[PDB]
């Protein structure tokens, strides 16, 4: 079967500097592939908690979030420095709405961000913010560019959280069929649940070529929350025969580990 | 705009109530723009029976519906509880699976099992509308499921329910099950399929939409998605998803969105959950 990777972002949705380790461990044991440890540039405490995650947990690859700015990327690099398998996670707008202040040209100031990041960590995931509302041909150009720049994973979010399944699905497929190099890189889904269609949307992206799903336990999150890790994963498992995807998740420990995080973070 | 009917079941499926409170939920449901609100299960007990009649006397705009076992006695009781209701509807049905008929209904086979045409004619004389669910339609032989729908409509059936009883169906899988029926049921024009999806995989809302994009013109749902197990399709969601895409789905309902949020917070509190 085709392996689909799970990128849990549930730690950035609230915890002291050891309850985060306990949660991150629970996540490691549940079988997530990438767990986002934090936002290192914000404060010494977040930096310190990120390096602390990279010492306690090492099987899954540890990710840190940072703005598309050389200064931040390098600091993020200092914090992930002890990670067995590290990864930075950055991005910049792709919608005309967003771009408007640059020019669709100067936006390629993303490539610079990627190379900068590849020089300081193992993997790099660049996300195209507001991807759902970007000129498709243009986003195609931005994905190709970021991949060429070296990005390992390019994220295509439904930032508004208002897209219908087949739509988001057609968006992924379009990139699959129009990026001249998506073969050497994993596209990732990221659907907010504003219309309550995040699980259905993430699965739609998976059925079209996306090989990574961004989610959080109980879909916890800002506004109407993100994709529910438990739902996407459990849904996939039920229709393996039809779908043909594997998650490395340890389904049994799914409920209790879910109960742990949701009760520790006090959800 | 293509009209999609909202058939609410919170008063029934969200079984956690009080005859007083029932009407309060029942009218709020009414002043929200719901086409059909299943008021209950008469047979169950005299209380539910009475509660029903008492609703049909306080709410009158939307069509009041009663859930009932095919049992003819049960059906006539249903009617009797809806006598006063302006627009009365009887919701009844039978198993659709080779699994159910062989293992639950046992005495019957695909053919005797079409004693369903029998229940639809009886019900069709005691009440205005008659919705007929082909239970476990998600697992029934599509060919036979077609014949049942064909047969139950040519028996009077105004609305045929096609519920994913398991609740583990995928958006498109279900989309086809409705598409097929629209493409293989000689007389669907003489009626309308109604979706009833369960949120076991947290895919009820999406499923209902797939259903509506393939012919279903009615949608079963509850406030907040309350119901057995993982509950069923949430009303706010579907209703607000069709609205944020009118220009693409070309679908609308007689729902007063402007009341969704509040009416949802009082139906919630009322049930304490």
Q: Is B198 helix (H, G, I), strand (E, B) or coil?
A: strand
Cβ(A19)–Cβ(A260) below 8 Å: no
B165 contact partners, CB below 8 Å, separation of at least 6: B135, B136, B137, B138, B139, B198
CA separation for the pair A245, A147 (Å, rounded):
24
Query: Cβ of B187: how many Cβ atoms within 10 Å?
Result: 12
The DSSP result for A143-159, as a single string, is HHHHHHHT-SEEE--BS
Using the beta-carbon criterion (under 8 Å), do B170 and A239 form an inter-chain contact?
yes
Closest CA to A94 of A167, A179, A157: A157
Angle at which helix A136-149 crosses helix A111-118, to 10 degrees, equals 30
B63-68 vs B192-196, strand pairing mode: unpaired
Query: What is the sign of the dihedral through the CA atoms of B26, B27, B30 and B36?
Result: positive
Please name the residue of chain B whose CA is at the shortest distance from the CA of residue A160. B244
Please name the residue of chain B whose CA is at the shortest distance from the CA of residue A207. B172
Min Cα separation B237/chain A (Å):
6
What are the tokens at A158?
């439904």
Cβ(A16)–Cβ(A52) below 8 Å: no
What are the tokens at A183?
């073969």
How far is CA A46 from its chain centroid? 19
Residue that is written with structure tokens 């008492």 in the block = B54
Cβ(B235)–Cβ(B37) below 8 Å: no
CA separation for the pair B17, B13 (Å, rounded):
11
Per CB-CB distance under 8 Å, the chain A contacts of B173 are 242
CA separation for the pair B114, B151 (Å, rounded):
8
What method did the depositors use to determine the structure? X-ray
Closest CA to A30 of A59, A73, A2: A59
Query: Cβ of A28: how many Cβ atoms within 10 Å?
Result: 20
Region of residue A115 (phi > 0: left; psi between -120 and 50: alpha; otherwise: beta): alpha
Chain B interface includes A242 (CB < 8 A): yes
Cβ(A24)–Cβ(A41) below 8 Å: no
First-last CA distance in chain B: 36
CA separation for the pair B195, B216 (Å, rounded):
6
Chain B interface includes A231 (CB < 8 A): yes
Where chain B is discontinuous (C–N > 2.5 Å), the residues before each break are 16
* Resolution rounded to one decimal, in angstroms: 2.8
Closest CA to B222 of B242, B244, B204: B204
Residue B199, φ and ψ in degrees, nearest 5 = -90, 45
CA separation for the pair A14, A19 (Å, rounded):
12
B265 contact partners, CB below 8 Å, separation of at least 6: none
Chain A interface includes B246 (CB < 8 A): no
CA separation for the pair B196, B209 (Å, rounded):
11
CA separation for the pair A215, A174 (Å, rounded):
23
What are the tokens at B6?
């909202």
Chain B interface includes A164 (CB < 8 A): yes
Task: For an interface test with A, give the residue of B173, B199, B204, B206 to mutate (most A CBs within 10 A).
Answer: B206
Using the beta-carbon criterion (under 8 Å), do A165 and B206 form an inter-chain contact?
yes
The DSSP result for chain A, as a single string, is -EE-EEEE-GGG----TTHHHHHHHHHHHHT-SEEEEE-TTS-HHHHHHHHHHHHH--SSEEEEE--S-HHHHHHHHHHHTT-SSEEEEEEEE-SHHHH----TTGGGTTHHHHHHHHTTSSEEEEEEETGGGS-HHHHHHHHHHHHHHT-SEEE--BSSS---HHHHHHHHHHHHHH-TTGGGSEEEE-B--TTS-HHHHHHHHHHHT--EEEEBGGG--STT---BHHHHHHHHHHTHHHH-EE----GGGHHHHHHHHHHHTT-
- B94 sits in which H/E element: strand B88-95
Instruction: List the single residue in B203, B234, B244 with the smallest CB-CB distance to A199.
Output: B203
What are the tokens at A221?
């999150």
Domains located in chain B, CATH noted: 1-272 (3.20.20.70)
* Strand extents, DSSP E, B21-76: 36-40, 63-68
Cβ(B122)–Cβ(B72) below 8 Å: yes
Question: Length of chain B in residues, anyone?
Answer: 273
Using the beta-carbon criterion (under 8 Å), do B171 and A196 form an inter-chain contact?
no
- B5 sits in which H/E element: strand B5-8
Using the beta-carbon criterion (under 8 Å), do B234 and A195 form an inter-chain contact?
no
Region of residue B159 (phi > 0: left; psi between -120 and 50: alpha; otherwise: beta): beta
Per CB-CB distance under 8 Å, the chain A contacts of B237 are 195-196
Per CB-CB distance under 8 Å, the chain A contacts of B207 are 200
Instruction: List the single residue in B202, B237, B244 with the smallest CB-CB distance to A228.
Output: B202
């Amino acid at each position: 079967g085709k392996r689909i990777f799970v990128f849990d972002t549930t730690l950035r949705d609230g915890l002291n500097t050891e309850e985060k380790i306990i949660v991150a461990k629970a996540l490691d044991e549940l079988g997530v592939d990438v767990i986002e440890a934090g936002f290192p540039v914000s404060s010494p405490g977040d930096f310190n908690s990120v390096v602390e995650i990279t010492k306690a947990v090492t099987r899954p690859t540890i990710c840190a979030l940072t703005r598309a700015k050389e200064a931040d990327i390098n600091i993020a690099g200092e914090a992930l420095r002890f990670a067995k398998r590290s990864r930075i996670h950055t991005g910049i707008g792709s919608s005309d709405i967003h771009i408007e202040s640059t020019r669709e040209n100067i936006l390629e100031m993303a490539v610079a961000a990627v190379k900068q990041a590849k020089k300081v960590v193992h993997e790099v995931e660049f996300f195209c913010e507001d991807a759902g509302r970007a000129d498709q041909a243009f986003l195609a150009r931005m994905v190709e560019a970021v991949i060429e720049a070296g990005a390992d994973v390019v994220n295509i979010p439904d930032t508004t959280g208002y897209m219908l399944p087949w739509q988001y699905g057609e968006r992924i497929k379009y990139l699959m069929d129009n990026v001249s190099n998506i073969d050497k890189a994993i596209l990732s889904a990221h659907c907010h649940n504003d219309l309550g269609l995040a699980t259905a949307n993430s699965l739609a992206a998976l059925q079209n070529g996306a090989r990574q799903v961004e989610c959080t336990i109980n879909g916890i999150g800002e506004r109407a929350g993100n994709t529910a890790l438990e739902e996407v994963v459990m849904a996939m498992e039920c229709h393996k025969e039809t779908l043909g995807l594997e998650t490395g998740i340890n389904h049994k420990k799914l409920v209790p580990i879910s109960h742990l995080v949701s009760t520790l973070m006090r959800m």
